[PDB]
Amino acid sequence: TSFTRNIVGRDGLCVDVRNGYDTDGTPLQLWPCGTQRNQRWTFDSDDTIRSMGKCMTANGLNNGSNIVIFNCSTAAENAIKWEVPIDGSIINPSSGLVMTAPRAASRTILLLEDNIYAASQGWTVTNNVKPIVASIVGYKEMCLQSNGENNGVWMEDCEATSLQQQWALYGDRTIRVNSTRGLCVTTNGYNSKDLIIILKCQGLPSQRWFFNSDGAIVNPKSRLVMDVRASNVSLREIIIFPATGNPNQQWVTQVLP
Numbered sequence: 001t002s003f004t005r006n007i008v009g010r011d012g013l014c015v016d017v018r019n020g021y022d023t024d025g026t027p028l029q030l031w032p033c034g035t036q037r038n039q040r041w042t043f044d045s046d047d048t049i050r051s052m053g054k055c056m057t058a059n060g061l062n063n064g065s066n067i068v069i070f071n072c073s074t075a076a077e078n079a080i081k082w083e084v085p086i087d088g089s090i091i092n093p094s095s096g097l098v099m100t101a102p103r104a105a106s107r108t109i110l111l112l113e114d115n116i117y118a119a120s121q122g123w124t125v126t127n128n129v130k131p132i133v134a135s136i137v138g139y140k141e142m143c144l145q146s147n148g149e150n151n152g153v154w155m156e157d158c159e160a161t162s163l164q165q166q167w168a169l170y171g172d173r174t175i176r177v178n179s180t181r182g183l184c185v186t187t188n189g190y191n192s193k194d195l196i197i198i199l200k201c202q203g204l205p206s207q208r209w210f211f212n213s214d215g216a217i218v219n220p221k222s223r224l225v226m227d228v229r230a231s232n233v234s235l236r237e238i239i240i241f242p243a244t245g246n247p248n249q250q251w252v253t254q255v256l257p
Ligand SMILES: *[C@@H]1O[C@H](CO)[C@@H](O[C@@H]2O[C@H](CO)[C@@H](O)[C@H](O)[C@H]2NC(C)=O)[C@H](O[C@@H]2O[C@@H](C)[C@@H](O)[C@@H](O)[C@@H]2O)[C@H]1NC(C)=O
Pocket: 063, 064, 113, 114, 116
């Protein structure tokens, strides 16, 4: 069974076969998302991912290997299989390396690299090529809110008119300030009780998040989850902390009008 989507990643750019060429070996790159065929990827039940009738192919299975388009029947079988872990990676099972956008820029060429759970290794398979804009509702039904670059995020009463409560959920698995999309929700370290702040998006593992089935917002590198510190909204501190299932770690997205 097959279905076709765009693949959105770093900075909301899409996986794109360079210059629309279908020549074997043409690299994959980032490019602003659109409907062109070299950005439409068909996911088949054989774990191939195809554009223009050819396969996404690792041109080698080493750290730093380029990913290219290549004829599905003549490519090495190992090199054309991909899986899509629930946290938003795109992994080549043979090598265990993951598809990575090493720079934010358009025309950055995609590589297989060691998985470090970086936001540069986050992807979203979707027909909607725009970030989803939502409030993030958590403990006491309050809303997560940003408060400027380098400052903490924290909880406030939900307001339809508070733009700092509006989050752009980007395809690279970053959570960005909707009005200032260069800025990312960032853990300031990977240890329990490190503080969650807003920092310039830099593709880092500290800027990657996963909304899991238990209502947690998980930082995959650390394993830890967003937590309203001490269940005390007046502290105005959100930290990462091990998942406990407690109310101060439950979150819902609510789409904004
Ligand atoms: C896989 O390729 C990665 C990207 O080139 C390597 O990480 C890079 O290692 C550089 C040192 O050679 C270092 O200056 C870069 O900052 C770093 N880049 C990133 C995005 O992490 C990786 O190298 C290993 O991991 C890094 C973090 C260092 O610890 C290196 O000393 C390691 O060798 C490559 N993996 C391997 C096994 O070589």
